[PDB]
Structures are given as C-alpha cells and as structure tokens.
Amino acid sequence: IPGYTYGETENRAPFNLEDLKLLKEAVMFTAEDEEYIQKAGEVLEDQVEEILDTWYGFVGSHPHLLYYFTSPDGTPNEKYLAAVRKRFSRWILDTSNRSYDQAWLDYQYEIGLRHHRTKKNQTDNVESVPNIGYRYLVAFIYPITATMKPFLARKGHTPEEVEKMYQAWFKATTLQVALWSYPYVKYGDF
Amino acid sequence: IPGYTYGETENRAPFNLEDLKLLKEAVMFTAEDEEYIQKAGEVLEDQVEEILDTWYGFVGSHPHLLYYFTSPDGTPNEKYLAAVRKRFSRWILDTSNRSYDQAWLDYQYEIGLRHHRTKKNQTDNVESVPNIGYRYLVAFIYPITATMKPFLARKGHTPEEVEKMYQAWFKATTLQVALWSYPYVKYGDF
Ligand code: HEM
Ligand code: HEM
C-alpha cells in the first residue's frame, strides 16, 4: 500500500502507554472492547469497499469537505483520493487487528501529522490545501461512527453483539481523533 | 445560577453562523435533529439530577479525571464541583432548548475558554489546575453521549424515537466539543 508506513515512522509519538491507558479510561474502553473491535474486524472486512464508497459519497457531495482533496484550482485530485482510500481501507482493519501499543501510537501521531499542515500532501506528493481544520476532524467522529452501524448488523450477529461492536467502534474512533489533535493543539495544552 | 452568563459575554465568538452551518453539515445535523433534540428536552428534564450523578460518579471514580476539580493539595474542591454542576445541569437544558443562533455560539466560545487555561478557574474564583488537556474533551464525547442513552429510553418512548433523540444528542455533543477546540488550537488551524 503506497505511503502506508506503519511500524516505520522515524518519529516516536509524543504520547506514551500511560497516556494511552488514561485516555482509554476516559473513553470507557476495556478488555471487553478489545474483544469486540476484533469481532468488527471480521464483520467489516468483506464490506470495506462498500464502506469507503459510503464515506466518499458523503465527502464528495459536500463541496466544503471535498475541498480538502482538491488541486489548487478547485478540482478534486483523483490520484490523491484513490491513494488515500487504500490507507483508509487499511485503517479500518488496523483499528480492529493491531495491538494498541507504542507502534500504534507512533502511527496515530503520523496520522495526526498528515491531516495537519506539518505533513499533509507530502505522503502522496500532491499539491492541495495546506491544512484540514481540526473542527472537521472532531465533526467526523459522528459520520465515521454512526455510518458503520448498518455494516455491522449486516452479517447477522446477535443484536447485543452488534451493539457491543458498534460501541467499541465509537470508542476507538473517538480515542484516535483525540490523539490526532496533538499537532493541532498549542504546546502544553494537549 | 452563579457564573451562568449565557447571552452576556463580550468577546463575541470568533465563528459565525456560516461556520456553524458547515460544521452542522459535517455532523449530519438537520432541522429533523432540532425537533428531536427538543424532544430530548422533556424526557431529560425530570432526570437531570440522576444524570449529573452518573457523570459525577464517572469523574469522581478516576483520579486522573477528578484532578481537574482539585485544590493544590490534591483533594476535590467542593465549591468548584457544586457551581460547575449547576451550570452543567443547565447546559443539558440549553442544548435541548436554545436556538443554535449567534448568542448560542457566543456561549460555546465562553465554554471552550472556561475549559482552557485562558478562562479556567476564573469563573468561580478558585485555585485549581491551570488547564484541562484537550485530549479529554474529545474522549468525553463518548461518555457524555453513550451514558445519556438509558435516560432517553426511560420515559417509555418508541425505540425509533429513542434512536432519533440519541442520534441528535450525539451530533450535538460532537458539534460542541468541536467548537470548544478553538482556544486550544494553534491560530489558523481550526
Ligand atoms: C473521524 C474522523 C476521521 C478519520 C477516522 C479519518 C481517517 C483517515 C485515515 C485513516 C487516513 C490515512 C492515514 C494514513 O496515511 O495512513 C486519512 C487521511 C486523510 N483524510 Fe482523514 N479522517 C478523519 C477526518 C477527516 C476529515 C474531516 C477530512 C476532510 C474532509 C479528512 C480527509 C483526509 C485527507 C485529505 C487525508 C490525506 C491527508 C494527507 O495528505 O496525508 N479526514 N484519514
Ligand atoms: C463532552 C465533553 C464535555 C462536556 C459536554 C462538558 C460540559 C461542561 C459544561 C456545560 C460546563 C459548564 C460551562 C459553563 O456554563 O460555565 C463545564 C465546565 C467544566 N468541566 Fe466540562 N465538559 C466536557 C469535558 C470535560 C472534561 C474532560 C473535564 C475534565 C475531567 C471537565 C471538567 C470541567 C471543569 C473543571 C469545568 C469548570 C471549568 C472552569 O470554568 O473553571 N469537562 N463542562
């Protein structure tokens, strides 16, 4: 997967495992959730293409959102959309498969950086808007959580198991957006 | 309600109603949600005491969270908790009742400031930690949202009306934390 550099960041994350433990508690994430994010693992894998179509359908239809993928001239960069889609697709599986350990926090930082002016547009070596405003990263907690629900019910699990899979997805998305705020936030306010 | 200055803040918010419309769209919030956030009004109004206890039981049970309410000597400040609880309770009703107009946005900015080192600890004239790290404001989207669900189900309402109030609450919680990021974020990255 071009530009996907998990495990090989070259910068350690400015947040450690203790931060992650405390942030896990704040988000009500337990060993129960560890189990259930993995059940979402297997439920979502067959559907990843239809999931991405849904999200891209949402981004594409709102010009003020599609904007973050556009060449300086206002037109959407197809190459850029295509290349990010693959890493987004990977990220669904990563969220469900990976140990939330130091390597994982290393990539969280990496992902925060790439949304932010620090590294945005560098990975795919494109010319686009310098920065995605943090307001929209937070906003996206909703559609990224809520739209995953139907896809979790699909493969016919027990409604409780659906509900617990959704609940873990909600916690993990929230947890990650929270960490991705690091490059955006004033030093010492994070 | 001491410290409650909704509608009377000076320093008018740095985001206007065009920003609020674009952020509403990012969180999938429509006139349908205004209706159902208003229906959360009456369901929740009775139970406000109970809800406050739930959120206080969560914060109070995690030292790294209760800490933001603590005197230099590391014990919780009873005056600080009591005054914030009164405003917090009122906020539930506000989220439900207030038109999301410019006076609403002005207070949103005030709320962001009171969590940030800019205006934290000044409202109730207390001595407490200088700043609530932003990471916890995002994380709290989860507990504020999910713990509200059981309360919406209590007034015996239809499961789909329950689902619609909950979705509205979730959208409205994310949207607000998103606006509160403003004082935390580096200039021009919001
Ligand atoms: C819940 C919130 C969000 C999630 C879960 C999410 C997820 C992701 C992931 C996994 C990546 C790939 C990281 C990698 O390179 O491995 C990515 C990149 C990207 N996303 Fe987001 N994202 C969110 C918010 C947003 C928002 C609000 C926008 C703007 C509409 C956006 C647009 C982009 C863009 C333009 C990139 C490529 C940035 C670059 O040049 O490196 N994302 N996102
Ligand atoms: C979804 C996230 C959150 C929501 C919805 C929320 C809600 C509120 C509200 C409505 C107020 C009263 C503001 C006013 O009217 O003056 C307040 C104040 C306060 N909250 Fe939060 N809050 C959140 C995150 C947090 C977190 C993570 C903490 C730390 C554990 C925290 C602790 C406090 C403190 C210490 C104050 C008083 C600050 C001051 O003015 O000195 N809150 N919150």
Integer tally of domains of chain A: 1
Give the termini distance of chain A in whole angstroms: 31 Å
Count of individual helical segments of chain A: 10
CATH topology of chain A: Globin-like
Could you tell me the number of beta strands of chain A? 0
Write the layout of secondary structure elements.
The structure is a homodimer of 190-residue chains.
Chain A: H1 17-26, H2 31-44, H3 48-61, H4 63-66, H5 78-97, H6 102-115, H7 134-139, H8 141-146, H9 149-153, H10 159-180
Protein name (chains A, B): Globin-sensor domain-containing protein
Pfam family, one (chains A, B): Protoglobin
Domain Globin-sensor (chains A, B): 18-187
What does this structure look like?
Two copies of one chain form a homodimer. The two termini of chain A are 31 Å apart. With 190 residues, chain A is mostly helical. Chain A contains ten helices and no strands. Chain A has a single domain, classed as Globin-like (Orthogonal Bundle), CATH 1.10.490.10. The structure holds protoporphyrin IX containing FE (2 copies). Residues 4, 59, 65, 68-69, 84, 87-88, 91, 111, 114-115, 120-121, 123-124, 132, 136-137, 140-141, 144, 173, 177 of chain A line the site of one protoporphyrin IX containing FE (HEM).
